[PDB]
Structure 1
Amino acid sequence: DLADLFPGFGSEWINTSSGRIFARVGGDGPPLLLLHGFPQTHVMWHRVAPKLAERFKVIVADLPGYGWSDMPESDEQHTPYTKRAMAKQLIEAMEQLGHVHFALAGHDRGARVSYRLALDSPGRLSKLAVLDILPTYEYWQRMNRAYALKIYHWSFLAQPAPLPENLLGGDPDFYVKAKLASWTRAGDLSAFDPRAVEHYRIAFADPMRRHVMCEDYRAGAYADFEHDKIDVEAGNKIPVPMLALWGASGIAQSAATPLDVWRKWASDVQGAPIESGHFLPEEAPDQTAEALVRFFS
């Protein structure tokens, strides 16, 4: 029932100290790690990874706790699902492949892992691409009526268990599809490959998977914010050359482009809007792929 959307990619279960990371691996050349976000899995890269795999060893991983990666036991502080912890786990996973210095592109939650990784261990990264995020700190700092309605799920999923878990169980299929549709330029699922939607839907149908996503968001409200706040206050910038791509209808320039935001977080950032909703690699795969290839090569 689950299509293989990365023909010619191998499938690796990468052991780490916190559990297995699942990854599709293809290509040859410099290693490039691609991290999806919510509510998706690695298959969201299915339209762009083949193009990346022309020039790179492309590692398309499920985030810890997402997709087919193992789900580490969480704790009161949601530690394993803090971006610091997920970055540490993915660094460990890349080390199991002998990749200690790699390029990194993350979308959504994966991009939050990615810039936290860049902040915590910039020596691991040759280049960083983040797709359609601002740092978690920025979202919370920007919090106002408009953002609270737009990213209500940041506060909804951060509610204490089991409130979101129980509500999500009310109609998980609807919810994951609603999230997918509502953040696209189209407003429907037509930008997505149906077989990828089935990947997302099946992952979301697992209550334990949904709980992990809530743990991720709870981290996003608490530890991840605090971690970012320390960096803002210390003036710590990302020293890795980075590319920030955003959907022109994701979250753009009401009073500051993402580029102006990322410049405060990174010393070397280039940016471009992509004609897309949130799901750049699926809504605008050619435009995301060429931007990524141009940047990483």
Structure 2
Amino acid sequence: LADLFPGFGSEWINTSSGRIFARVGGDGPPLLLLHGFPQTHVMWHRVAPKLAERFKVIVADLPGYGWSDMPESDEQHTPYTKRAMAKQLIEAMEQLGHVHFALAGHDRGARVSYRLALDSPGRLSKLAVLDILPTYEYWQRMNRAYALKIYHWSFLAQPAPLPENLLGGDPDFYVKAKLASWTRAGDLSAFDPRAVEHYRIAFADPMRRHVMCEDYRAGAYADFEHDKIDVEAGNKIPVPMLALWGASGIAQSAATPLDVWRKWASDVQGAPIESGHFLPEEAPDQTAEALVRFFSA
């Protein structure tokens, strides 16, 4: 596998829930970058160098993803709930001396991020979420059109071992199918092939695949329940937040993203990026410029 972060160090951060792998580079204020599915920390490889010019950039594999350890799940998928992932990444950041840091997350990592901001807002200076709406919102907007577009939300949430067994016959196909279908082009051209190989290799591990399903099971159940409580209780993220989404990404299908996020956060700025779902890879300059601008204010 390629080193896609020349000059970045590599850290295995112990937490109570397992080691978090991260690439670490730059200097300045700490900025944690979290990837989503079916990716690893390397998805940040085109924007992290630009962020590293101004921030101490920590590009972490989510708990259970990439080279991070896989906490054994349970019937409630607890370690793969965004609440648990956020606590675990808070612990990891603490291990590095970062008790207050900026956070940008993409996809699942963005869900960890806004859950972290709801549970532990004191930990965050600024939060950026890329191409997501809160999990609750996706579920509450899950009509026929949306059920078809993000079928995987319900497919991967099926009880084990059903998605695992189906994924295992040809894992390469599925990871590549998901990378391609959520891009603007609908193919792999936006991805550095070396990055694709990272994603495919992670996806090749049955245990990694199971973790992704656990993440999605959490997504369907506990994560939804957690969000539901906050939305019903009128709890908004108090952390200044940037919501970026791809003009042809997943978030914008369910709804107008800024309107949704203004319901969830008291200080939200939003901007679309002409991109599919994979903003930092489909639109690295634009994404990085948006993140740099936002985190630098």
Q: Which deviates more from structure 2 when the two are superposed, residues 245-254 or residues 177-186?
A: 245-254
Q: How far is 1:251 from its partner?
A: 3.2
Separation in structure 2 between the aligned mates of residue 43 and residue 221 of structure 1, nearest angstrom: 26
Q: How far is 1:225 from its partner?
A: 0.2
**For each residue in 1:190-234, what CA deviation from the matched residue of structure 2 results, as whole angstroms up to 9, or x when unmatched?**
000000000000000000000000000000000000000000011
Separation in structure 1 between the aligned mates of residue 253 and residue 289 of structure 2, nearest angstrom: 26
DSSP-derived class of the 2:280 partner: helix
Separation in structure 2 between the aligned mates of residue 146 and residue 25 of structure 1, nearest angstrom: 40
CA RMSD of aligned residues (A): 0.8
Between the aligned residues of both structures, percent identity stands at 100
Structure 1 gaps, min length 5: none
Contact 2:246–2:275 (8 Å) recurs in 1:
yes
Tell me the TM-score normalised to structure 1 length: 0.99
Separation in structure 1 between the aligned mates of residue 158 and residue 77 of structure 2, nearest angstrom: 12
Q: Which deviates more from structure 2 when the two are superposed, residues 251-260 or residues 135-144?
A: 251-260
Contact 2:157–2:214 (8 Å) recurs in 1:
yes
Structure 2 gaps, min length 5: none
Contact 2:246–2:252 (8 Å) recurs in 1:
no
DSSP-derived class of the 1:254 partner: helix
Q: How far is 1:253 from its partner?
A: 5.0
**For each residue in 1:237-293, what CA deviation from the matched residue of structure 2 results, as whole angstroms up to 9, or x when unmatched?**
000000000000013556841000000000000000000000000000000000000
Change (3 A) 1:255 1:52: closer
Change (3 A) 1:27 1:166: same
Separation in structure 2 between the aligned mates of residue 202 and residue 129 of structure 1, nearest angstrom: 28
Change (3 A) 1:26 1:222: same
Separation in structure 1 between the aligned mates of residue 280 and residue 215 of structure 2, nearest angstrom: 22
Q: How far is 1:171 from its partner?
A: 1.1
Contact 2:245–2:252 (8 Å) recurs in 1:
no
Q: How far is 1:88 from its partner?
A: 0.2
Tell me the TM-score normalised to structure 2 length: 0.99
Change (3 A) 1:99 1:255: closer
Q: How far is 1:33 from its partner?
A: 0.1
Separation in structure 2 between the aligned mates of residue 254 and residue 182 of structure 1, nearest angstrom: 14
**For each residue in 1:144-183, what CA deviation from the matched residue of structure 2 results, as whole angstroms up to 9, or x when unmatched?**
0011100000000000000000000021000000000000
